[PDB]
Amino acid sequence: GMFVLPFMARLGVTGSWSGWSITGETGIDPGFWSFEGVALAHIVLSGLLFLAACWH
């Protein structure tokens, strides 16, 4: 039932900070742009856009 995971994978986000990858590899380092980093970036963007909306 995964809906956004395939969209992250489509454009190159395949790994977790916890060490797994969707291709089944172990001990990979995805850097910051893991599934979690993508999620975090979108949450922060949301907050910044919210604050900008208040200003405008």
Partner 1 sequence: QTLTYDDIVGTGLANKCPTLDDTARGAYPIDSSQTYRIARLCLQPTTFLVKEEPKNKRQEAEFVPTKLVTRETTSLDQIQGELKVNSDGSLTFVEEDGIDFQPVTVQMAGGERIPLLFTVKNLVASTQPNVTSITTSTDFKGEFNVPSYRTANFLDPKGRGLASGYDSAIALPQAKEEELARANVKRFSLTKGQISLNVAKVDGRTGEIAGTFESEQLSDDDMGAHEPHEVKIQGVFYASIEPA
Ligand X SMILES: CC1=C(/C=C/C(C)=C/C=C/C(C)=C/C=C/C=C(C)/C=C/C=C(C)/C=C/C2=C(C)CCCC2(C)C)C(C)(C)CCC1
Q: Which residue ranges make up the annotated binding site? A: 42, 56
Q: How far is CA 5 from the centre of its chain?
A: 9
Restricting to residues 1-56, name those near ligand CLA by CB under 6 A.
4, 7-8, 11, 13, 38, 42
Query: Is there a contact between 22 and 6 (Cβ–Cβ < 8 Å)?
Result: no
Based on the shown chain and the rule CB under 8 A, indicate whether residue 18 belongs to the binding site for partner 1.
yes
CB of 5 to ligand X, least distance (A): 20
Burial of 51 (0-12, 13-18, 19+ CB in 10 A): exposed
Q: Which residues bind ligand HTG (CB under 6 A)?
A: 16-18, 29, 31-33, 36, 39-40
